Design a protein around this ligand. Structure first.
Ligand SMILES: [Ca+2]
Ligand SMILES: [Ca+2]
Ligand SMILES: [Ca+2]
Ligand SMILES: [Ca+2]
Lengths: 579, 571
């Protein structure tokens, strides 16, 4: 168990630059004492001064009350909340209740990370409980929310909902694969309907979870970025400079598109050449593209880094906007690097494959090739993601009075922050595969289903021992990923349909695209209406009712003719008798 | 002017069955004085007794405070508000703050109309001011809101905004008519872009006006219908009966489709026959359809009545749901009667006109014909609409009231429906005749006055009803914009000449969606929100063992500093 330490700061000190390092250390200690936190300094690995900080319960209660009042202010209104508030006290500047010791912004640049400590007793029991069960109840997600915050809990709830909704497409994918034959239009229609239903039901469940956890409306709260650089104050940044920096994305995206397209064109030409030249034993004919998938986590990886670089010079005032831009860039890059091969096979090679002939001349049309390539692009990338996610850290860790706890912290600070964006991106890519390309290989979703059951555990293990405890954040929604899902639905309703007409055989293709797109729109409207006509809303209404119950001259002669009661009745009766 | 009269009670008494009429009048007067309104009985017209009711200012102030507290409760928070509150006190049941004398629910069914009085001095000045102007500033709409309530004000604001936005339609319609010949794809794209821009900008204006008038969120308040009929109480109506009654709309819609389609088919066949037989001097070639247009306000009118009858037996708990259902049925019927003739001309006769030959033989291909039809479906339906709207000691005050109660209650749904139909014409069929928008501009300038006159002297003063937006008409506008995006490209391809039609439809619809997303993003990136944020900020400002031995090694701060320095020297 931990030693009561609530937060941990690294503050590594190099061999040189010690003269200002000591000043930074004393400034950090003075600020941490001023804000009202108890501090304890110990030695660490590689010449570092590891400082543990905890809480004067009166000041902590005052901070809790101030935060609750602020949450009530915007209409928004446990270990996760306590850790989040301690992190806010550590991070927020002196202007609004804190002592800003953020690494990148101020002169306190000798700190590397401020992170909480993992609870091994909770972690092992959580892993055992999640591995010994078949399904996960809402109580498990609630425990995740209480311990690791709302972002991790929201990701795990989304993963559970996705895994539970993946049964239906698995079921009728197996039905279509066993009976309906290859490239069934009915399967495409059912896949589009399931995508619409899952997206809308996840929106409803997201609203319900936000109401239940009391995090409804946190997205409207704007949080300033400590590393944001401004020029004037009236903190403002000229939007022209930001637009100029953003315009650099377009040539970057075009260059990435050209490079990836050329690489996939060469790989597809090579695989066609070996399939049409060599006899093999059948399986070696897809050897190139398989390698391509094995190369996918590498190149895209460095590409992701470039995206981060593109988000560094692209200044953003708020955390939400910066996160949304980073998610957009990462989603575009991963969409490219994960679907360009399938798009080229389905909509370039299949319709008019008479353009690759020069490339086949450099080395020296089966419609069922798309099904095999989808099978490979379903099974192999999942295996390689498993390898790079769970077992390669297994090998990495296998290679490697109070000494036990100190050693545990020293080994803990070497790990990386848990990036939930990567897991969100992987799940969104899987959903996209199901939505737009599962028609070629109907069993694909089934395989994904199995992987999801592993992921819900494996990703949990990734937060158990493969990564250090993340900062507990609050999120109303899963964020811009929702939009991505919608996109991967809509274009999917096109793409799958465009597969069915193309691999089963000009006007018919366009007619099929029209019918599929309009069917997708119609079922979207119908499901939205059905869900609007169908717990969180009832609780909000009950709270509103409880608050409501707890909250409490001709003119001057015209009106003097019959001022009384009997006078009016008598005149009315008399004139009734008159008429 | 008025005699301080705030509301007028009709209570017509029939000569036959009078024994229960005196008791009803006595109960009416007793309840109306129980709620706290001064009443004055006077003679009516044709065996009726009109009683004028006004306001004990203390009770009116208490009611005002209660209404404001209720508005604050739901998050929502002048003569119109006073009249609305007096209406609520007159209408609301005695169980919850009022004395229910609603005409249709209880046995007090002898009252017919529940209406206030017009101010002639205000009405003539308003008409003179609006007739002598060229453009209307926001002060006129604010005065309309202060006088006739928020529904009429919202309608007039929508009419003014849509008339102002129609100027670009007319501009590039004239540009295309002069230069781009006939059936220009560029005009179709511009019309779709304008439809999207106008729809989104009117939504933004709706939000700004709801914030400005303090009616932001009124639509969230569910108001119960006095005419609602319930079986049990837990007032609950079995939804299965409502669904069974709603299912009667499908056969009615199908029968109306069949009848109107047969009428359009036979009129089209007759006009084709006379164009291919009669020589003339011409203009008579579209004589049949013109008559159909002249026949449109009649038959559709009775259809509208059927619709409301279909909404009477279709019991609705809330006012909003009943109004939405009525708007949906009326919009469907008017869409049919006003667009299915052009739909037959464009997408049935033009593509394959070989199926109308049996009708021509019973009586016994031009690709520019549709444009001519678009002319006769633009200048004729509005002109006849004009003929529908405006062409066809205390004795003076009492006579004025007696003449006032003979008028009909002013409905805003009809004017909303007419404007929505005109917008649908522009969005879907204006490509055939690009000048149509120009005409729809001029009529608009008349309508903004003419409709005002319809409320000035041709109808009784409407009950001031607060509304958040224009209602379900936004859905109609969006549907018309999307259908126009499809139909403009379809007409362009079909009249400028099988695979290319679908490609053009795809390109136009996807361009419509892309510009919809772009305009939504631009408007989200770009008055009332600033005021709401400032109010929120103002409210924010106004609102306010080894375990123990581990932390005992360095209890203070100077000791921690010394220990840190010592460990620094140790590295
Ligand atoms: Ca995985
Ligand atoms: Ca993962
Ligand atoms: Ca008119
Ligand atoms: Ca009108």
């Amino acid at each position: 168990s931990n030693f009561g330490v609530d937060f941990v700061i690294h503050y590594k000190v190099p061999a040189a630059e010690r003269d200002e390092a000591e000043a930074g250390f004393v400034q950090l200690i003075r600020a941490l004492t001023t804000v009202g936190l108890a501090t304890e300094v110990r030695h660490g690995e590689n010449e570092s001064l590891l400082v543990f900080v905890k809480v004067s319960p009166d000041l902590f209660a005052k901070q809790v009350y101030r935060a609750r009042l602020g949450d009530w202010l915007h209409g928004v209104r446990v270990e996760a909340e306590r850790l989040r508030l301690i992190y806010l006290m550590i991070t927020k500047p002196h202007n609004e209740g804190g002592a800003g010791v953020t690494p990148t912004n101020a002169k306190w640049k000798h700190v590397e990370s401020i992170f909480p400590l993992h609870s091994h007793s909770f972690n092992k029991e959580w892993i055992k409980k999640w591995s010994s069960k078949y399904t996960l109840e809402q109580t498990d997600i609630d425990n995740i929310r209480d311990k690791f915050g709302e972002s991790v809990a929201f990701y795990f709830a989304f993963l559970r909902s996705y895994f539970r909704f993946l049964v239906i497409p698995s079921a009728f994918g197996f039905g279509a694969w066993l009976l309906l034959g290859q490239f069934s239009y009915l399967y495409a229609l059912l896949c589009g309907l399931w995508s619409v239903v899952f997206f809308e039901y996840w929106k409803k469940q997201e609203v319900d979870l936000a109401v239940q956890w009391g995090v409804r409306g946190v997205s409207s709260i704007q949080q300033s970025r400590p590393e944001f650089e401004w020029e004037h104050e009236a903190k403002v940044y000229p939007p022209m400079k930001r637009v100029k920096t953003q315009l650099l994305q377009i040539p970057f995206a075009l260059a990435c598109v050209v490079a990836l397209g050329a690489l996939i064109v060469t790989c597809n030409s090579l695989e066609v050449f070996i399939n049409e030249v060599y006899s093999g034993p059948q399986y070696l004919g897809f050897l190139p593209t398989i390698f391509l998938v094995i190369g996918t986590p590498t190149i895209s990886g460095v590409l992701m880094g470039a995206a981060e670089k593109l988000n560094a010079m692209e200044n953003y005032a708020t955390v939400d906007a910066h996160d949304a831009a980073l998610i957009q860039k990462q989603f575009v890059l991963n969409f490219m690097t994960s679907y360009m091969a399938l798009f080229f096979t389905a909509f370039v090679y299949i319709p008019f494959g008479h353009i690759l002939h020069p490339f086949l001349n450099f080395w020296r049309i089966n419609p069922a090739r798309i099904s095999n390539q989808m099978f490979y692009f379903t099974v192999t990338p999942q295996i390689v993601n498993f390898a790079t996610e769970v077992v390669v850290p297994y090998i990495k860790q296998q290679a490697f009075e109070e000494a036990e706890f100190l050693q545990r912290v020293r080994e803990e600070c070497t790990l990386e922050e848990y990036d939930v964006s990567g897991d969100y991106r992987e799940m969104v890519m899987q959903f996209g595969y199901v939505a737009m390309f599962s028609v070629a290989w109907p069993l694909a979703a089934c395989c994904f289903l199995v992987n999801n059951w592993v992921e819900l555990r494996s990703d949990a293990l990734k937060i158990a021992i493969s990564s250090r405890r993340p900062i507990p954040w609050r999120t109303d929604s899963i964020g811009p990923w929702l939009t991505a899902l919608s996109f991967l639905s809509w274009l999917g309703s096109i793409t799958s349909s465009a597969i069915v007409y193309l691999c089963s055989n000009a006007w018919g293709l366009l007619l099929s695209i029209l019918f599929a797109e309009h069917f997708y729109l119609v079922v979207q409207l119908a499901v939205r209406f059905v869900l609007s006509k169908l717990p969180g809303l009832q609780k909000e209404r009950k709270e509103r009712f409880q608050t409501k119950k707890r909250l409490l001259t001709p003119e001057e002669m015209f009106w003097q003719r019959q001022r009384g009661m009997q006078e009016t009745i008598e005149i009315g009766r008399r004139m009734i008798e008159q008429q």
